[PDB]
Amino acid sequence: RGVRAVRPKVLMRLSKTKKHVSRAYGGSMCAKCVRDRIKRAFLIEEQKIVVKVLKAQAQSQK
Amino acid sequence: VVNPLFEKRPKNFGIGQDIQPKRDLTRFVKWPRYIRLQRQRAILYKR
Amino acid sequence: QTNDLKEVVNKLIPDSIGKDIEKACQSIYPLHDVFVRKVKMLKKPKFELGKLMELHG
Amino acid sequence: AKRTKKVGIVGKYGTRYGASLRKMVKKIEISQHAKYTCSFCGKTKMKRRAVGIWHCGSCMKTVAGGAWTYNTTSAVTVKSAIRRLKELKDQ
Amino acid sequence: GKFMKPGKVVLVLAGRYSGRKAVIVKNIDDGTSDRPYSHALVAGIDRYPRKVTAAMGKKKIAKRSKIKSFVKVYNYNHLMPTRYSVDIPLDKTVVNKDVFRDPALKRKARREAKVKFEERYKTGKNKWFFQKLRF
Amino acid sequence: SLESINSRLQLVMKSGKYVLGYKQSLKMIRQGKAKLVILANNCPALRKSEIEYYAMLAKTGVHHYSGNNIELGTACGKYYRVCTLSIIDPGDSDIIRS
Amino acid sequence: GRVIRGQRKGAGSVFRAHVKHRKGAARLRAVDFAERHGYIKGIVKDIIHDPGRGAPLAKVVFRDPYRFKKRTELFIAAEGIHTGQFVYCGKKAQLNIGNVLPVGTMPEGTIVCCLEEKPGDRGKLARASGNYATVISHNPETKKTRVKLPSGSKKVISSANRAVVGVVAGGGRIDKPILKAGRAYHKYKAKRNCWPRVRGVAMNPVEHPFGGGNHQHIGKPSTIRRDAPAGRKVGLIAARRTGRLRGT
RNA sequence: GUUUUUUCACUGACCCGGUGAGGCGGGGGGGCGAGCCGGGCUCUCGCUUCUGGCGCCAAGCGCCCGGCCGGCCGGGCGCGAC
């Protein structure tokens, strides 16, 4: 959405705002798959800390 | 005095964790056919 | 599970497992000719020579 | 109504190719065109895109399956055997 | 229990500020006549302060360590709340819901959070919040 | 407790209050009304962790149901499929203890 | 005097393969440090159709360990691989389906495919649709393994070589009758000029050694010497036994 | 001894395969179980597997070196990466 459906060598003429949407991964990725990857980036990077804190508290009893 | 934003950010160069550092590969270069020749000529004097 | 392979055999030379089962089943149906009819060795760990010589001493 | 007595999807081949060949391809032609329940969304949207490649029209998830059926007998029993072999490697 | 408190850190899920971290300053769990939906006021950081390193100048570090904040009412489901908390004042007198009709009072709520976030970046407290989520 | 978890839902469907689906259940976690949030085992593994994380903040228990969204639908006595199921009131039931 | 069709086949030109719409070389991943000591993770981007090949392929994208670039591989897709599945490749990778690891580090009776006949050649054996090779038995001394090939012939294989776990996808396509000549035309049009197979007895005696005669017969024994020259070597090539197969 | 010969295996011509010839072989030092009484040997490991994110152009720590006025305004080299 928000990007002109036009033959690709015309894109030189088009203004910047005709070629992207004003967002992270604008005119490259859809809004749906960005905000599911803001979740996937987060919940994986949290899960790293969950095993990081367990790593030392699985070691420390030996 | 220690500026607390300055975080120690160590890289884990384990298999499939971080990128490998640009280390020394002098002994893994595909050498020219003359550099290759004059070295494995010196081997035949020792073999 | 509760003890090691040297201490199971000194239960197996008598009927320490073949008597325990006989007594504890008298209340369900009283049964007489209980043994442990066979023990088959499946999985040994990595062989260390010391533990073998400890069985022979 | 019920149109054909005992020819189904293979009514399109008319008199051609013989009964016992058309009787064979019907069991295939039903399966390869049949919509299957996608195990990833639950929707009956798994259709055969091409040969051995099955596509959920809801998930947009492509699976490498059998030619005329989503799962083959061989591939299932291998997945059961590879599971059972992995239950012995780690015990 | 109810976890969407004015102490929460929040990943902005949708909009121009997608993937940005923000602090809930107000929580309206049952919406008004203007906003039927359950909505929060958040104050987050549009431009994060760039990664700073020893053997950079005191003038260069100060230039490098600059927060550009936003202040924005979102839906709850257009936010992603986290276990983190940034217990920062962000006074209700400025950062407020009578900020969006008067444009100059949005520049001051933008200005207030800028002074507040820049000082607690420099302390080293809540150092997760001042690093961008990598998506 | 495989048919117990099926039967303990069937009674919550009759007597107690419940919410079917993801978006409406995600409010009942966020409104602090969720006591048990059940998930079907073929839900997106991203959105499985989305529920687990919200339920961790609200200190809500997450059950991982032993069937796909079609069976969880049949477990709810519904004529469709349901992944996410946040239970508000068990009523006259014993689902959120055991 | 005329050259037989088989000899014209080797010459090339009209019997060269139709590799226009054939989609890349269906190779394995190259042996590096993270194939030979531990493993490297990769996602299946899309399962894809390769014209002239019954089995579908998989665009599998591995992040590069040395440069910031990202690598893409075309695997003979194991049956049950799907898009967004994590495929692992190395010595320490787990024994589940569509997951390559060396034949040395898997038990006996293990079903594999895209098996390497030599360590490093990047996947040669058992990589047609619905085919599997069984890991028969190991030899830790000498580092070698017997592996039953799809034909049913056990090869001694050097255990330092790799195979993706599971049967190849597109399995059981030769069950369906090619009902009409149209389906056969279209099959071999994606491959090479081999289809409209004129039998030698129909041909004249100058083109083919079985041709000629007032009746349409072979005349000479159809079973031929292995040592026979090209042009002559026609029919049943070095037939140990022949005729209707009785016994096993 | 000399020569012939047979089987085991050697590499170094010769052949093959892969790669952008990207970590080969030995040794050393940090994990892990086993073994006598803080010390030591024959071994084992080397970091990533709940998710269709993300990663490169170094942080850190040492070490040297050029003005205004021991204090501030900028460069190099070593490890990290044996």
PDB file of N, CA and C in Angstrom, chain D residues 39-40 52-54 61-66 69-72 74-76 78-79, chain G residues 44 47 56 58 76-83 85-87 96-99 165-171:
ATOM      1  N   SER D  39      -2.242 -28.584   8.522  1.00  0.00           N
ATOM      2  CA  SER D  39      -1.896 -28.924   9.929  1.00  0.00           C
ATOM      3  C   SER D  39      -1.318 -27.708  10.667  1.00  0.00           C
ATOM      4  N   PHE D  40      -1.182 -26.556   9.992  1.00  0.00           N
ATOM      5  CA  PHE D  40      -0.554 -25.315  10.518  1.00  0.00           C
ATOM      6  C   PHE D  40      -1.600 -24.227  10.804  1.00  0.00           C
ATOM      7  N   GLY D  52       4.580 -33.170  -5.983  1.00  0.00           N
ATOM      8  CA  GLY D  52       5.302 -33.323  -4.705  1.00  0.00           C
ATOM      9  C   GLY D  52       5.332 -32.054  -3.874  1.00  0.00           C
ATOM     10  N   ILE D  53       4.675 -30.981  -4.327  1.00  0.00           N
ATOM     11  CA  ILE D  53       4.729 -29.624  -3.700  1.00  0.00           C
ATOM     12  C   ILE D  53       3.285 -29.178  -3.433  1.00  0.00           C
ATOM     13  N   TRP D  54       2.913 -29.111  -2.150  1.00  0.00           N
ATOM     14  CA  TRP D  54       1.544 -28.826  -1.640  1.00  0.00           C
ATOM     15  C   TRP D  54       1.526 -27.455  -0.963  1.00  0.00           C
ATOM     16  N   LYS D  61       1.940 -21.335   3.134  1.00  0.00           N
ATOM     17  CA  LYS D  61       3.006 -22.278   3.557  1.00  0.00           C
ATOM     18  C   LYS D  61       3.042 -23.447   2.567  1.00  0.00           C
ATOM     19  N   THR D  62       4.155 -23.597   1.842  1.00  0.00           N
ATOM     20  CA  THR D  62       4.392 -24.677   0.847  1.00  0.00           C
ATOM     21  C   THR D  62       5.066 -25.859   1.556  1.00  0.00           C
ATOM     22  N   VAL D  63       4.572 -27.080   1.322  1.00  0.00           N
ATOM     23  CA  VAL D  63       5.093 -28.356   1.901  1.00  0.00           C
ATOM     24  C   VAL D  63       5.573 -29.245   0.748  1.00  0.00           C
ATOM     25  N   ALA D  64       6.731 -29.893   0.911  1.00  0.00           N
ATOM     26  CA  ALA D  64       7.257 -30.931  -0.005  1.00  0.00           C
ATOM     27  C   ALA D  64       6.657 -32.286   0.392  1.00  0.00           C
ATOM     28  N   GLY D  65       5.574 -32.695  -0.279  1.00  0.00           N
ATOM     29  CA  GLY D  65       4.821 -33.934   0.001  1.00  0.00           C
ATOM     30  C   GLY D  65       5.009 -34.980  -1.085  1.00  0.00           C
ATOM     31  N   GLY D  66       4.064 -35.922  -1.187  1.00  0.00           N
ATOM     32  CA  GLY D  66       3.997 -36.942  -2.254  1.00  0.00           C
ATOM     33  C   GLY D  66       3.467 -36.358  -3.550  1.00  0.00           C
ATOM     34  N   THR D  69      -0.653 -37.557  -3.434  1.00  0.00           N
ATOM     35  CA  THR D  69      -1.189 -37.432  -2.050  1.00  0.00           C
ATOM     36  C   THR D  69      -0.245 -36.553  -1.221  1.00  0.00           C
ATOM     37  N   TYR D  70      -0.800 -35.817  -0.252  1.00  0.00           N
ATOM     38  CA  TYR D  70      -0.072 -34.867   0.631  1.00  0.00           C
ATOM     39  C   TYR D  70       1.017 -35.614   1.411  1.00  0.00           C
ATOM     40  N   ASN D  71       0.649 -36.729   2.051  1.00  0.00           N
ATOM     41  CA  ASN D  71       1.571 -37.646   2.775  1.00  0.00           C
ATOM     42  C   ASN D  71       1.600 -39.000   2.060  1.00  0.00           C
ATOM     43  N   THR D  72       2.799 -39.554   1.849  1.00  0.00           N
ATOM     44  CA  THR D  72       3.030 -40.938   1.353  1.00  0.00           C
ATOM     45  C   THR D  72       3.227 -41.869   2.555  1.00  0.00           C
ATOM     46  N   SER D  74       5.408 -44.304   2.870  1.00  0.00           N
ATOM     47  CA  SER D  74       6.876 -44.425   3.075  1.00  0.00           C
ATOM     48  C   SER D  74       7.385 -43.268   3.947  1.00  0.00           C
ATOM     49  N   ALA D  75       7.047 -42.022   3.594  1.00  0.00           N
ATOM     50  CA  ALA D  75       7.529 -40.784   4.258  1.00  0.00           C
ATOM     51  C   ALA D  75       7.042 -40.710   5.713  1.00  0.00           C
ATOM     52  N   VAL D  76       5.831 -41.203   6.005  1.00  0.00           N
ATOM     53  CA  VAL D  76       5.233 -41.225   7.378  1.00  0.00           C
ATOM     54  C   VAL D  76       6.010 -42.222   8.248  1.00  0.00           C
ATOM     55  N   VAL D  78       8.959 -43.526   7.792  1.00  0.00           N
ATOM     56  CA  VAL D  78      10.351 -42.997   7.932  1.00  0.00           C
ATOM     57  C   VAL D  78      10.371 -41.981   9.081  1.00  0.00           C
ATOM     58  N   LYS D  79       9.432 -41.028   9.089  1.00  0.00           N
ATOM     59  CA  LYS D  79       9.284 -39.994  10.154  1.00  0.00           C
ATOM     60  C   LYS D  79       9.026 -40.664  11.512  1.00  0.00           C
TER      61      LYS D  79
ATOM     62  N   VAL G  44      14.059 -22.846   5.164  1.00  0.00           N
ATOM     63  CA  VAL G  44      13.497 -23.206   3.827  1.00  0.00           C
ATOM     64  C   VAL G  44      12.662 -22.007   3.354  1.00  0.00           C
ATOM     65  N   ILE G  47       9.679 -24.185  -1.198  1.00  0.00           N
ATOM     66  CA  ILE G  47       9.684 -25.448  -1.975  1.00  0.00           C
ATOM     67  C   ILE G  47       9.254 -25.114  -3.407  1.00  0.00           C
ATOM     68  N   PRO G  56      10.467 -32.115  -6.075  1.00  0.00           N
ATOM     69  CA  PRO G  56      10.604 -30.669  -5.896  1.00  0.00           C
ATOM     70  C   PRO G  56      11.897 -30.320  -5.145  1.00  0.00           C
ATOM     71  N   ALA G  58      14.139 -27.111  -2.747  1.00  0.00           N
ATOM     72  CA  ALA G  58      13.952 -26.160  -1.626  1.00  0.00           C
ATOM     73  C   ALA G  58      15.048 -25.090  -1.669  1.00  0.00           C
ATOM     74  N   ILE G  76      17.554 -31.197  -2.917  1.00  0.00           N
ATOM     75  CA  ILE G  76      16.573 -32.283  -3.214  1.00  0.00           C
ATOM     76  C   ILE G  76      15.684 -32.448  -1.981  1.00  0.00           C
ATOM     77  N   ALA G  77      14.511 -31.820  -2.021  1.00  0.00           N
ATOM     78  CA  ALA G  77      13.647 -31.637  -0.828  1.00  0.00           C
ATOM     79  C   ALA G  77      13.230 -32.991  -0.243  1.00  0.00           C
ATOM     80  N   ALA G  78      13.553 -33.223   1.035  1.00  0.00           N
ATOM     81  CA  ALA G  78      13.076 -34.374   1.838  1.00  0.00           C
ATOM     82  C   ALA G  78      11.562 -34.240   2.036  1.00  0.00           C
ATOM     83  N   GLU G  79      10.845 -35.368   1.995  1.00  0.00           N
ATOM     84  CA  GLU G  79       9.363 -35.365   2.068  1.00  0.00           C
ATOM     85  C   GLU G  79       8.940 -34.991   3.486  1.00  0.00           C
ATOM     86  N   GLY G  80       8.155 -33.922   3.596  1.00  0.00           N
ATOM     87  CA  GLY G  80       7.702 -33.352   4.880  1.00  0.00           C
ATOM     88  C   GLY G  80       8.419 -32.057   5.234  1.00  0.00           C
ATOM     89  N   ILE G  81       9.345 -31.577   4.391  1.00  0.00           N
ATOM     90  CA  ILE G  81       9.939 -30.211   4.529  1.00  0.00           C
ATOM     91  C   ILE G  81       8.845 -29.203   4.159  1.00  0.00           C
ATOM     92  N   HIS G  82       8.786 -28.079   4.876  1.00  0.00           N
ATOM     93  CA  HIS G  82       7.857 -26.952   4.604  1.00  0.00           C
ATOM     94  C   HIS G  82       8.618 -25.626   4.703  1.00  0.00           C
ATOM     95  N   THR G  83       8.009 -24.549   4.203  1.00  0.00           N
ATOM     96  CA  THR G  83       8.583 -23.178   4.185  1.00  0.00           C
ATOM     97  C   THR G  83       8.623 -22.631   5.615  1.00  0.00           C
ATOM     98  N   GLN G  85      10.753 -23.756   7.868  1.00  0.00           N
ATOM     99  CA  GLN G  85      11.337 -24.843   8.699  1.00  0.00           C
ATOM    100  C   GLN G  85      12.846 -24.607   8.803  1.00  0.00           C
ATOM    101  N   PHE G  86      13.415 -24.787   9.998  1.00  0.00           N
ATOM    102  CA  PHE G  86      14.870 -24.645  10.268  1.00  0.00           C
ATOM    103  C   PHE G  86      15.585 -25.953   9.910  1.00  0.00           C
ATOM    104  N   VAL G  87      16.391 -25.915   8.843  1.00  0.00           N
ATOM    105  CA  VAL G  87      17.270 -27.026   8.373  1.00  0.00           C
ATOM    106  C   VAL G  87      18.676 -26.787   8.933  1.00  0.00           C
ATOM    107  N   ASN G  96      16.592 -35.590  12.876  1.00  0.00           N
ATOM    108  CA  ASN G  96      15.185 -35.412  12.419  1.00  0.00           C
ATOM    109  C   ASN G  96      15.211 -35.153  10.906  1.00  0.00           C
ATOM    110  N   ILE G  97      14.044 -35.119  10.254  1.00  0.00           N
ATOM    111  CA  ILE G  97      13.915 -35.198   8.764  1.00  0.00           C
ATOM    112  C   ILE G  97      14.252 -33.840   8.134  1.00  0.00           C
ATOM    113  N   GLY G  98      14.816 -33.879   6.920  1.00  0.00           N
ATOM    114  CA  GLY G  98      15.218 -32.705   6.123  1.00  0.00           C
ATOM    115  C   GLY G  98      16.321 -31.929   6.811  1.00  0.00           C
ATOM    116  N   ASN G  99      17.331 -32.652   7.297  1.00  0.00           N
ATOM    117  CA  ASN G  99      18.364 -32.162   8.246  1.00  0.00           C
ATOM    118  C   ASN G  99      19.649 -32.949   7.973  1.00  0.00           C
ATOM    119  N   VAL G 165      18.389 -36.240   5.965  1.00  0.00           N
ATOM    120  CA  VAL G 165      17.583 -37.338   6.579  1.00  0.00           C
ATOM    121  C   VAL G 165      16.168 -37.274   5.990  1.00  0.00           C
ATOM    122  N   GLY G 166      15.644 -38.416   5.526  1.00  0.00           N
ATOM    123  CA  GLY G 166      14.271 -38.561   5.002  1.00  0.00           C
ATOM    124  C   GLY G 166      14.248 -38.932   3.529  1.00  0.00           C
ATOM    125  N   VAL G 167      13.126 -39.497   3.070  1.00  0.00           N
ATOM    126  CA  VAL G 167      12.854 -39.838   1.639  1.00  0.00           C
ATOM    127  C   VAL G 167      12.676 -38.538   0.849  1.00  0.00           C
ATOM    128  N   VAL G 168      12.978 -38.566  -0.453  1.00  0.00           N
ATOM    129  CA  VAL G 168      12.857 -37.391  -1.370  1.00  0.00           C
ATOM    130  C   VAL G 168      11.365 -37.178  -1.657  1.00  0.00           C
ATOM    131  N   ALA G 169      10.937 -35.916  -1.762  1.00  0.00           N
ATOM    132  CA  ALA G 169       9.534 -35.511  -2.022  1.00  0.00           C
ATOM    133  C   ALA G 169       9.148 -35.847  -3.469  1.00  0.00           C
ATOM    134  N   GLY G 170       7.856 -35.732  -3.794  1.00  0.00           N
ATOM    135  CA  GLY G 170       7.276 -36.157  -5.084  1.00  0.00           C
ATOM    136  C   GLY G 170       7.205 -37.668  -5.201  1.00  0.00           C
ATOM    137  N   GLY G 171       7.156 -38.369  -4.062  1.00  0.00           N
ATOM    138  CA  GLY G 171       7.259 -39.837  -3.978  1.00  0.00           C
ATOM    139  C   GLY G 171       6.019 -40.527  -4.519  1.00  0.00           C
TER     140      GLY G 171
END
